[PDB]
DNA sequence: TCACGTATGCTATAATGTGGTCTGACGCGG
DNA sequence: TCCGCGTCAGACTCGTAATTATAGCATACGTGAGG
RNA sequence: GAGUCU
């Protein structure tokens, strides 16, 4: 692919599959030529190390280098490692619908409540507001419903303050070490930039306001909304499953 | 433990004759006759030769076997092309050989997208003069000040020196330690976002709507030329395949229709609205 | 250590006592870096398993 | 006496401790290295001359031609640093070195008279440092970090364990030059000494000893003392050394004389030992058995065959020795080798070997490092030789032979960089005592075997690379070439030197974008020391022994500054008065102790120095101008410490301070803080963000003015005199006549910079400290720079906090601040962010960046100007075009729907795009500075050309404006000199000063001081025109930008951002927090006198943190904000000048044992009131690193205040107006606020563009993408129940393509339905197993 | 021992993810191994329900 | 049948075996 | 007994974007436009 | 590469 400053990027996997082509072919001309033997034999040596190189580079003894001093990254090596696709783009994956931000205290909150900055829950609720607007029939379409969200008027804050009502969102903190990493909450839309979490539950998430941040997701499904609020619910996890004792305690 | 290719390959080359001048003229005639033993052995003897510039031509473009088989590719026409007749020794003739198939296929194979031999040569001008221009003015060459020495065009200096740039890695991580690679940083530029692509079926399925709020005439030819409802996107004389036949009525009606939809869109709320967009 | 430190920080530490507290610290601090790890691989492992 | 910035604000000092030596010049190793490096040495081998006579001369492989190197010299840099930084180029100077291609003659011998031709050749330009320590590399400010590695010469180290559950401690010496292969020798479990070369196979380590010529004999007789057998009549006798048997067990009766001394089968203990010695023992009768096993020394053979009866290092039996006895050998050198002190190792090592001669050697050492290759005799011995005894491929450094030196204990430092033979055995032997158990083994960690590389020495090795590279290449040409039309410039190449350079100033890892967050941040990092990168350990490779406090470490490296990190513990400040010996140890200065009275001389010892001799503590009681108070002293020796009497004393720390470094010296109460917790307050101190109005600290430590200074961020008086112009821009300063030189006009000007962009988007501004007309002294701050007061180093804002819970707004750390702190506008920031707008050539044709853009409002191109720029001044808030770009599109194939709504509109709008630069969205500015490059050639732009003409007009009137004042103040002085012989006053100043060149006076000294004012005048007048024409140059001159880029506009923005919730803030003693609510005024707690505290910090937060420095620094902070309550109310009532100075020196000689002595008295009364005005707003006080004040002291203070002398005060609940139940402790914490705000830290995404190959989301802000859900957050919802919000994360939500629009639609249409898919990462996955050739298919149902 | 119990699972999908996928998928390759995805991770990978 | 970028082709003093980083650790096979 | 290969917590932020060297000229190979 | 939570 071309990056912006006109220059072009790509794939080792391109250098290791020039190279096999390259030996190849030449291996197919020295036999059109009938070569002498030590010069054939070398050529087969050259082919069976590229094709290793290309497969596992680095099993075969020394890892060809690339333009760094790097080895080249191998199609093995695309699985492998835990960077594989395994365990980065499988067994967990980037999603959409998720935010972050600072977080702070919320002493007035109750329990399964948490403040959501305004600008926060704008972007991230955005389908559901082009949803409403099209059934109150302010919005005639999806376009002019996101110019009409882009200059933040304020009859969107009142529909926004509706879809947000009974709908739940995922606070999650790293690490996740056990299940109460994730807690469901009902949100508070607030004016700020900072997630503002209830106090009893930062004994699940070890959380402490010096500077801590946190993920917020969103439940889209009617399915996914249900168990957040039956199953994640930080009302509904209150003992810890770890030892029978209550998670939530003073402190 | 002798396991690497090189150390393989150098030991066996050692371990072949070296040829004399009388026995180089009596193995060439009967080489270009077409014997298989003196070809052989004309090749296997005077691959050391090739190792020797090989070794000499590392560190630009390909790998030291690389440049040894490309270069025994030279070694093999030399044979095919020697003059045994003429006194001069084989050893000077093929040192051309080698060094011009050697160079070749760095100059072909060494870059990931293909630079032709004939940039390429130009390239070198350009450096060469470059390194001349550095040893006097302290500082490096201008694009202009290359282009004012070799009397050429500065948008040609600049394409050529845009061709030397050499690609960057996808697959390498950046930020020093293995932290993030260019790949994940880098979006996919031809998918659209859910985003745009659900704004392209809202406006498709509002266009059928709007299909059957205008005139039956006056969506029968704006479509069917747009290519909307029809197969093939026509223009206002090719219109007049269909039933219209018309070159004039085909343009007042094309406007006709775009005119009563302009007005579609002020009173549903657009037009200056997704005017921006 | 041999030597314990015999001040607290209300009497304040001399240049000694904070020196020799240093090794602790830091000693606790890159314990936090590292061991870490190893935890986290235990907790991997008994998921796989499990 | 103090100085006149001291005489404006004087601080407090509760320190006791005279200071002997002054805190010296921070940045004094940056400096001091780089200089070397550059510096022209003739003899002394520093940077580039050594570099040039290492590899130099160059001579061919024909031997007829040579190039030889005569000397360099560096041109002056193209471009000033402020061109190079705005530009974007590198700040260097051009390398031109004079070389000499010399010829022979191949015909005669080696006659040199044939070409010799010599040019001074360009090689590379080499970066330069600043004055301040840093290098401007493509337009950014960078430091290289000095380097912390293993020193070459010796190391003798052990596996303890590790190998063999036999648990066998196997000894090994190590032998590190500075460059080649290294030596290792090592010790196996059965005891063989073993040899690797580059640690490549081991070898026998007594194949070595064959290479260099060594027989079997002459081996034995190096390492084992011989025992002489004498076989006398019949009976054996042998030679005895009284001791060698010592803690043996008799295995025969030994009989001395005729009389028995042992008893056979007993230990022989001291007094048999004595006994057998004093009687002169020489000769013991011994049984023939004991020789069965003892080893024969020489080569012994039959005199009468000439044939070997044994070989040298031969077992002995009974019948060997009867053969050698009727040959006619009564005498028998046998090895001495009895376990325990001496073993037989080397005996064993000779039956291992498999090589017999020295070519047998030489040949197996080849055939390790080039296995396969047939040994040839000159290549065994070329590559030997080459290996260790090689001038150019070997080279341990004056540091290696030295440290090699003093480990095998000898008397010379100095000596050859090549191995000798008589160093590897030496080496050899000492292992072998190491392993018998006389001798131990050197410590890694310990600070004599790390040494510090800085710049000049890092900068060297590139720089020798180069040649290097370059010596290939000049020997191939030297060599092919006819030599006579070849000239030695053409064969040199320039771009290996330069591009070895660059790689290093640019891609190496110690070359790091300066930390500029503040001025604690920059000199903090350019005192860096790290043991990572090239040449150095890794994360990987790091252990946890390297990584703790050694011993050592006391006086160099600082205990307790080292980031909390994967970097802790490689990654080390220096301490505050550590330095680089010759060498490059570090060193520590101590107080000699002569006779137990305590001088003022001063040595600094290297760490091995240290060890020898017992040093008294800093805290060591001196009795007035003699010796210790106390009889036993606190001392330390051998790396511990305990109580010492006082002739035993040899020195003393010189400062309680030394220990420490210096961003932890700034720590006020650091005595009475966890270290913990005080290493994160010296870390966060150096992410304080500087505010718009820089407060003092009230609560100072003293390192405070030393800081502002030497980072050299404030502009300091040189010169000194009198300022004769202010300016929010410039200071001039008229110099006095004691410095200013007779030459030159002695005028200094001082530009200060104005509000300028740091690298980490902060602001840089330079105000001016001195009004109009104050006189100044040579090292007196005449600007503060960003984060500083009056000379003091001022990195964030005190404040009136409490001590007590809120309802709940203050839980874990959490901050409550009152609206005052921002109305106030204090903690307000200034962030400088530079966007850039690139126009480039593409294949469809190049980018315009014109106003005429496609598809845009009115309000958006109201704001551009004729060329499509932004003016200056103008707000902008995100979506706003900055500078408009369209870009040339080819061919647009339209879907239907866009080319019916192309008609309709008929904004065709050409065949060009929007590629505009436009604010990013949510930062919000106003536009400060517009900068535009062009190319050469291509037409400049309207702004363009406008902002040549500004820049050109204001140079001319800063040129004129130093010609102007230059000559007004060169001829103020020729009037002087004028008046001195020949009174003219009324009559000079009548006629121009233009037409003075005819006015002289007698021949004498004052004439030639007229000629010199009068050479300097026009001097200046012809400079003033070459100046103009260079600025003139470099404003036309058409930059050469990356190929394809036509022109390039730079946008400043100026944002203001305001503190707020989210916000960090901490305190130095590592207290962190989050903003949690801003509280109205009312709502605060206010004192009795209503009062209201700015902040209101968690009580809970200190006992369980062990950080009681917070609550000293704001017992104190009270006390001193009570006094300058006191000033402020004084000052208000006017009062007397008598009264003010009375209350204010007993205020200042306040402190039990003070050391500060302040006799007021002198200061003038204008001095007074100035001084009271500064410190009215809190009188500032210093407490010293481990000599602070002291709670009584403090206490002292309070009641000097009238405030309390708990500290606790009752306050009132601004709320209900009651009062709180108990006391609550309030004064002044200075608090600071990081770089960490939550504005930079807030994002939000619902949908966006996603990545190349897995179709997942981007990661980032930066790239608008979604958080990553980890594995560990995928176990949470599988140990919930919750199943649907996992597929969703796994596919609408990442990859599934079609899922994730379909769904989209679905929530627009309110349907709330998944629809899920197949995640294009699995099917990536099988596309990546099959290319690997497993067949991997779904099986259908 | 956890280790070779989690790779010892007749889920070579668990057995690649979790440790030594080179290893996992040659043995599984030449045993023509066919996972019908009972368990856990085995669902997550291809994106199904739990 | 050229016009114009691309490609193949040949040169003859003699020359004929290559040449960066160097240190983890604790487990478990072969 | 010694070498080989295999593992080694989880997110987040920034910031930047390099180097070398391969000759010169005559016929050979392919497509499009104009005569 | 230098950081921020654990
Ligand atoms: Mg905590
Ligand atoms: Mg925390």
Redesign the pocket.
Known sequence: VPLDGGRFATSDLNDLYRRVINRNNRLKRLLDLAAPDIIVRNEKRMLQEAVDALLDNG?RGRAITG???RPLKSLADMI?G?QGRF?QNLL?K?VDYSG?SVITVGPYLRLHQCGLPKKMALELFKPFIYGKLELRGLATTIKAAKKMVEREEAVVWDILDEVIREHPVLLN????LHRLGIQAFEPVLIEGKAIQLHPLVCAAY?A?F????M?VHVPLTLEAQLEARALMMSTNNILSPANGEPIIVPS | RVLDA??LY??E???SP??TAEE?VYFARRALRGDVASRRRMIE?????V??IA?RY????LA?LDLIEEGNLGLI?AVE????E????????????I??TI??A??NQ??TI????????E???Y??TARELSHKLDHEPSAEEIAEQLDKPVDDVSRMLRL???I?SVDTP????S??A?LD?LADEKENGPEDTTQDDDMKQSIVKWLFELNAKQREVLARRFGLLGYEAATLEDVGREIGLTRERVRQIQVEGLRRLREILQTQGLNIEALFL | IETPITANFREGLNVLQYFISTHGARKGLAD??LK??????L??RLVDVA | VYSYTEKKRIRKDFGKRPQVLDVPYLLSIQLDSFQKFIEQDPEGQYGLEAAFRSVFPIQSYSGNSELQYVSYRLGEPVFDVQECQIR?VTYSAPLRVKLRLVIYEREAPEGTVKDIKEQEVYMGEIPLMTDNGTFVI???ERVI?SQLH?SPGVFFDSDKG???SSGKVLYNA?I??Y????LDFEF??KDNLFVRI??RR?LPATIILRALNYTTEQILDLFFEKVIFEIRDNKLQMELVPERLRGETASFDIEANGKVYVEKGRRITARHIRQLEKDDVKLIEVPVEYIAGKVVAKDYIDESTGELICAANMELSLDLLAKLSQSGHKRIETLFTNDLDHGPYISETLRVDPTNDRLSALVEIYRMM?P???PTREAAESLFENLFFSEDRYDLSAVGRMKFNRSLLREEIEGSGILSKDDIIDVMKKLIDIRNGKGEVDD?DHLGNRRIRSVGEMAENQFR?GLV?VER?VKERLSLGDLDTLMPQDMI?A??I??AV??FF??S?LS??M?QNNPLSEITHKRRI?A???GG?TR??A?FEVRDVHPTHYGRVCPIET???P?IGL?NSLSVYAQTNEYGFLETPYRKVTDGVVTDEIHYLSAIEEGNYVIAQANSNLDEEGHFVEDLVTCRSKGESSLFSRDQVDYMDVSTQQVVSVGASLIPFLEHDDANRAL?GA??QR?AVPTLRADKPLVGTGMERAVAVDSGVTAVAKRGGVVQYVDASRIVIKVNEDEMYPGEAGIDIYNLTKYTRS?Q?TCINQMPCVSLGEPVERGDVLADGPSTDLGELALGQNMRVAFMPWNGYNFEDSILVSERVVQEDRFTTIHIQELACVSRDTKLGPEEITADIPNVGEAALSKLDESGIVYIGAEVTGGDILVGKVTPKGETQLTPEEKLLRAIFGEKASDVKDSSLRVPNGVSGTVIDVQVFTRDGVEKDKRALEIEEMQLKQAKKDLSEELQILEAGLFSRIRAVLVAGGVEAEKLDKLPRDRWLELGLTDEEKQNQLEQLAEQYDELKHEFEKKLEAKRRKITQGDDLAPGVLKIVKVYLAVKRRIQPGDKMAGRHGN?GVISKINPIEDMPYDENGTPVDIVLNPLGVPSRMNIGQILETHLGMAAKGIGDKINAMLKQQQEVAKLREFIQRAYDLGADVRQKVDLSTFSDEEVMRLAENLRKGMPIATPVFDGAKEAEIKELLKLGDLPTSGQIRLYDGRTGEQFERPVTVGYMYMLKLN?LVD??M?ARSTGSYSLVTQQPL????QF????F????VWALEAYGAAYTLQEMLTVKSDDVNGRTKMYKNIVDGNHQMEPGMPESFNVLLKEIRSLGINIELEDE | ?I??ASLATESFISAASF?????VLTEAAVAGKRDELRGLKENVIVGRLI
């Open positions: 099993r333009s760094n001093k492998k835990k365990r967990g980037r972050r903190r790293a690490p996740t070890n402490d010096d500077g801590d941040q993920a | 090189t150390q150098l030991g080359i050692g371990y070296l040829l180089e003897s005077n691959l050391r030769l190792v020797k070794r590392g560190n630009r473009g030291l026409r092309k020697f003059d045994p003429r006194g001069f020794r084989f050893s000077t003739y093929a040192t051309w050989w060094r011009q160079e070749r760095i100059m060494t870059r293909r630079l032709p031999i004939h940039i390429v040569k390239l070198n001008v450096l060469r030397n740039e050499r960057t950046l930020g020093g330690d932290e993030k260019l940083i | 936090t870096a870490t790890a190893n935890s986290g691989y907790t991997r | 974007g493509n337009g950014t970090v293993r590790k190998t063999h190590r590190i030059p460059r080649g292969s290294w196996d479990p580059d640690r081991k080039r396969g290759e047939p890694i690379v590279r290449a190449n771009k290996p330069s591009a660059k790689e640019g891609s890892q790091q974008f930390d790290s990572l990168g090239p350990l990987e490779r252990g980031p909390e990190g970097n990654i994160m870390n966060m992410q690298n988007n962190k960490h930079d830290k994002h990661g980032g802000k930066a993408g979604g958080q990553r980890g594995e560990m957050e | 021992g280790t070779k440790q030594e996928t080179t290893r």
